[PDB]
Every structure is written in structure tokens, then in C-alpha cells.
């Protein structure tokens, strides 16, 4: 019975209409995509040399925020659940960076494209810092002048956004419903005339205005939820919507398991 109608689509954002579901399910889907869809992100930085003007943990802090390709992350384990001694190939990706400026003039800009994957759970496509094109240098990390060097080793780990926002696959999630306020869930503030002073939703033409005579349907419920899921490139937009649903299933499944085992 739930129906979906995709209004627009591209690699990093999907705009869609969701219908024939309960408000609570639309909201729980919104929350799950923001908070519980796993991704991969740097979580340990070993600084062997940093003679730049930026403080050590300042640079380390920027590193944690770099979005990494997380496509095959479902087959990867959490570090806290792995049976091994220290890290290994099954629970972490190791990245390395080394930059230096030779010459007495000019500035060497250190970009996220200099992050080199060194090991990783082959041959899974995980751990490369996301790029828009091939000639795109990416995210600015630091800047170097003559004789200043930066040589760091980064450990990337699987995590969820509940622990730290760097693991979130979404950015914003636009979300709205009932553009003409037929349900009367809001009571509009106005100075003179409520209709002229409030702007129209960008989905005003997707539903029909209330007729001037029409009585209030006290049985009507919210039923069409338009949302747009933008991502950072760490996951493709279609994967986020799919894995949001998948993750929410196992959580309910885990609850169902516990009831039939507690007797």
C-alpha cells in the first residue's frame, strides 16, 4: 500500500513524494537517515611531523570531517565487535598524507586529493576521499610555506552519527506536507490577511487549494510527504534511502527477537 513518486533525481540528491503512510513513519525515516545510517570516517590520526602554523588537533579535526566513499561499508565490521588484536584489514582503512614546500617563495596548498589509501579490506570500494570530477582538488586542509612539512597517518573507522556528526551521510533533509494547511495543524500569524502575508510552498501547485465553501474534514489525515535527501557524496542518494529503510528494519527485528526469547 505505500507508494512513492520520485519528482527529481541525480547522484547526490533525490527529491521524492511519499504517500499512504503514517506521519510517524515519514518522521522516523527522516531521523534514521540522519543519525543511524553507517558511514566511514577518519577516527585516529597519528602525527609524525607537523611544522605548519596550524595546531596538531586543529588539523586532525579537519581530517575527521573529510567524506569518504562508504559504498561497501555493510560488509565491514565495527572495531568494537572484532575478535582481532589491535587493528587489521577487516575493521579499518589506513590512509597516509605527506606534503612539503620546496622553494623560498609561494605557498603549497594541501588538499584532500593528496590522501593516499595504503591498505583496506580489498577489494571493497571504500576509503577513497570523495571527488566531484577528476580534476577537482577537493577540500582545503592546510597551507604550507618554505620548509614547513606535514606527514600524518590516518585510521578510518566505521561509525554512526549518534556518536559524532562526522559519520552522518546526509546534510539537510527538506521535508514538508499539506502545503495549503487543509489539516489546520498550524494557526497562521498575520497582521492584516493571512493568505497574502505568507509565501507559497514550493509544492503549492502539486495539490489543489481548498474550495471557498468546503467544510472542515475532521477525519482527514496527513497523507502525502514530500522530502529531498541531500548527501555529501560519502554515499549515493539512492543508497541512503535504501539503507535507511534496511537499518530501521533490523532495529524492529531486534525488538521482535527479544520478546520471543524472554519467555
Amino acid at each position: 500500500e505505500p507508494k512513492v513518486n520520485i519528482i527529481n533525481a541525480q547522484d547526490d540528491e533525490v527529491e521524492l513524494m511519499l504517500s499512504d503512510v503514517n506521519l510517524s513513519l515519514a518522521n522516523s525515516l527522516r531521523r534514521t537517515m540522519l543519525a543511524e545510517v553507517p558511514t566511514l570516517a577518519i577516527d585516529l590520526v597519528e602525527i609524525k611531523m607537523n611544522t605548519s602554523v596550524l595546531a596538531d588537533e586543529f588539523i586532525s579535526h579537519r581530517l575527521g570531517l573529510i567524506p569518504l566513499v562508504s559504498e561497501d561499508v555493510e560488509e565491514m565490521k565495527y572495531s568494537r565487535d572484532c575478535t582481532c588484536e589491535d587493528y587489521c584489514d577487516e575493521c579499518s582503512v589506513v590512509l597516509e598524507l605527506s606534503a612539503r614546500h620546496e622553494g623560498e617563495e609561494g605557498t603549497t596548498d594541501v588538499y584532500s586529493s593528496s590522501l593516499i589509501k595504503v591498505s583496506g579490506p580489498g577489494n571493497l570500494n571504500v576509503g577513497e576521499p570523495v571527488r566531484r570530477d577528476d580534476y577537482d582538488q577537493g577540500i582545503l586542509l592546510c597551507k604550507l610555506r618554505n620548509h614547513q612539512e606535514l606527514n600524518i597517518r590516518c585510521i578510518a573507522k566505521k561509525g554512526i552519527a549518534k556518536e559524532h556528526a562526522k559519520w552522518s551521510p546526509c546534510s539537510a533533509i527538506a521535508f514538508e506536507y499539506d502545503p495549503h494547511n487543509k489539516l489546520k495543524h498550524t494557526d497562521f500569524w498575520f497582521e492584516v490577511d493571512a493568505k497574502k502575508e505568507w509565501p507559497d510552498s514550493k509544492y503549492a501547485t502539486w495539490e489543489e487549494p481548498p474550495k471557498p465553501g468546503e467544510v472542515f474534514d475532521y477525519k482527514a489525515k496527513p497523507n502525502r510527504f514530500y522530502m529531498t535527501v541531500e548527501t555529501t557524496g560519502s554515499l549515493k542518494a539512492n543508497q541512503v534511502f535504501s539503507r535507511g529503510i534496511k537499518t530501521l528494519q533490523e532495529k524492529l527485528a531486534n525488538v521482535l527477537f527479544e520478546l520471543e526469547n524472554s519467555r
Binding site: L44, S79, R80, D86, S92, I155
Partner: protein, 47 residues
């Protein structure tokens, strides 16, 4: 005890892979002053 004040790496648990220093080693439960957040934790010797 011969392991106080020597540098340590943690190989199991939620703090697996982190550097620390043995601050106090009374018995079985160690006190590692973790480097990474400003906190000193109680931890078992198997780890």
C-alpha cells in the same frame, strides 16, 4: 609492578587502538591516562 608509566596500546574494547600511559596499577584493573580525550579510564589487564 614493572609496567607503570610505560606507554601502552589497547587491543580490545571501545578504546581499541589508542595510546596511553599506566597511571596506577593497583591490581587487575589498571588506570590508563588515555592520550586522545582528556580522561583517565579504569581498564582490565587482558585488554
Amino acid at each position: 609492578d614493572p609496567t607503570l608509566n610505560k606507554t601502552v596500546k589497547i587491543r580490545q574494547g571501545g578504546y581499541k587502538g589508542k595510546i596511553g600511559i599506566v597511571k596506577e596499577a593497583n591490581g587487575d584493573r589498571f588506570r590508563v591516562e588515555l592520550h586522545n580525550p582528556n580522561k583517565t579510564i579504569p581498564i582490565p589487564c587482558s585488554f
